[PDB]
Amino acid sequence: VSKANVPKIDVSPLFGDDQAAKMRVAQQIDAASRDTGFFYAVNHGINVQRLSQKTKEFHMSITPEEKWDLAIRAYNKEHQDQVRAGYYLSIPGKKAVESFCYLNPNFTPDHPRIQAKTPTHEVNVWPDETKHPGFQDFAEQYYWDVFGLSSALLKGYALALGKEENFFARHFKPDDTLASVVLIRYPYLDPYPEAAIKTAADGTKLSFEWHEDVSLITVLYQSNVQNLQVETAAGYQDIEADDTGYLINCGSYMAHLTNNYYKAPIHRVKWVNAERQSLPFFVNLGYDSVIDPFDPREPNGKSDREPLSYGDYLQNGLVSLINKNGQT
Numbered sequence: 001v002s003k004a005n006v007p008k009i010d011v012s013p014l015f016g017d018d019q020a021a022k023m024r025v026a027q028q029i030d031a032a033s034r035d036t037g038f039f040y041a042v043n044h045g046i047n048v049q050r051l052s053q054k055t056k057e058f059h060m061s062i063t064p065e066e067k068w069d070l071a072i073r074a075y076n077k078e079h080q081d082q083v084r085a086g087y088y089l090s091i092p093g094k095k096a097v098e099s100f101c102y103l104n105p106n107f108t109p110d111h112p113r114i115q116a117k118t119p120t121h122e123v124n125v126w127p128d129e130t131k132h133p134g135f136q137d138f139a140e141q142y143y144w145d146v147f148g149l150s151s152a153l154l155k156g157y158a159l160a161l162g163k164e165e166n167f168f169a170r171h172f173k174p175d176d177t178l179a180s181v182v183l184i185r186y187p188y189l190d191p192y193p194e195a196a197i198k199t200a201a202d203g204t205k206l207s208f209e210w211h212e213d214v215s216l217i218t219v220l221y222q223s224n225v226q227n228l229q230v231e232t233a234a235g236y237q238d239i240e241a242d243d244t245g246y247l248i249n250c251g252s253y254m255a256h257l258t259n260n261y262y263k264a265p266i267h268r269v270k271w272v273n274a275e276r277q278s279l280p281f282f283v284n285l286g287y288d289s290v291i292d293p294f295d296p297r298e299p300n301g302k303s304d305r306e307p308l309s310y311g312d313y314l315q316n317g318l319v320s321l322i323n324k325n326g327q328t
């Protein structure tokens with residue numbers, strides 16, 4: 001098993017006004033997106049140590065009672081409005097992973113998409129403030145911190161594709177973004193149940209089988225335990241861990257709109273018996289967002305691919321990933 005080339009890219013110019021320096025970042029994004037599909041964003045300005053510490057405190061103090069109270073409908077039939085946001089329970093002896101997903105904090109009963117009951121929009125559910133002091137405040141602020149990083153990364157991606165820097169980011173707005181944060185706990189277990197370990201075709205023991213991300217891009221923090229692998233023509237390659245940076249990759253919406261020029265890399269999760277964290281931010285656009293596809297390989301840039309509304313893409317995509325990879 002070889003090692004994936006995952007370059008560290010200083011993205012700090014994307015927050016500034018030095019346009020040539022932005023173009024040099026964009027070139028690095030282009031190169032990584034055309035190679036393995038992954039890079040590490042460094043000098044991102046987010047306190048990822050606090051993120052890991054607050055997430056750990058939550059994961060390790062939430063009780064079985066609180067997990068039922070917050071559970072998505074896959075685990076609690078009383079919560080039919082919770083398809084996305086809420087707690088995803090572990091099943092001791094069967095399913096090791098557990099997680100907590102939340103959406104746009106601006107999705108409230110006042111929001112017209114909530115009033116209209118549009119699919120993929122939900123009001124976040126939260127534990128008791130007194131039992132989890134500061135957790136909701138931290139989690140909402142983290143959403144906006146990583147939103148700000150993601151907006152800048154989208155400027156880099158736009159420039160990399162020869163577009164104006166707001167080509168993607170203009171569709172990424174606090175008032176309607178369908179972006180999500182997921183706080184995933186992968187536990188240490190002794191004994192680790194074999195029922196929670198899948199075996200790949202090539203013999204590798206996995207926690208999560210191959211998939212493409214349902215996103216425009218994915219902005220991922222992981223603790224310092226190597227686990228991820230990216231598929232290449234020569235087979236799967238290990239992505240080295242870095243708990244100070246963000247692992248960035250394109251999702252299938254980006255592959256669609258670039259005519260596969262920037263592929264959505266196929267990746268999977270090796271089984272590792274180690275307590276660790278996987279904290280993705282899925283950069284999703286608004287429900288009605290449509291980006292006209294193009295092909296940077298053709299002089300005219302023309303693509304035959306149909307424009308796709310993001311909301312319908314996201315609804316279809318999240319159902320599909322459950323069916324193939326299983327309920328997480």
Ligand SMILES: CC1(C)S[C@@H]2[C@H](NC(=O)CCC[C@H](N)C(=O)O)C(=O)N2[C@H]1C(=O)O
Nearest residue numbers: 084101180182184208220269278280282328
């Ligand atoms: C490889 C990943 C980072 S991505 C992969 C997998 N992804 C998902 O389940 C999509 C979650 C979507 C979310 N509930 C929403 O409504 O927006 C997961 O979890 N996996 C992570 C993992 O196992 O670390």
Ligand SMILES: [Fe+3]
Nearest residue numbers: 211212213267
């Ligand atoms: Fe993924």
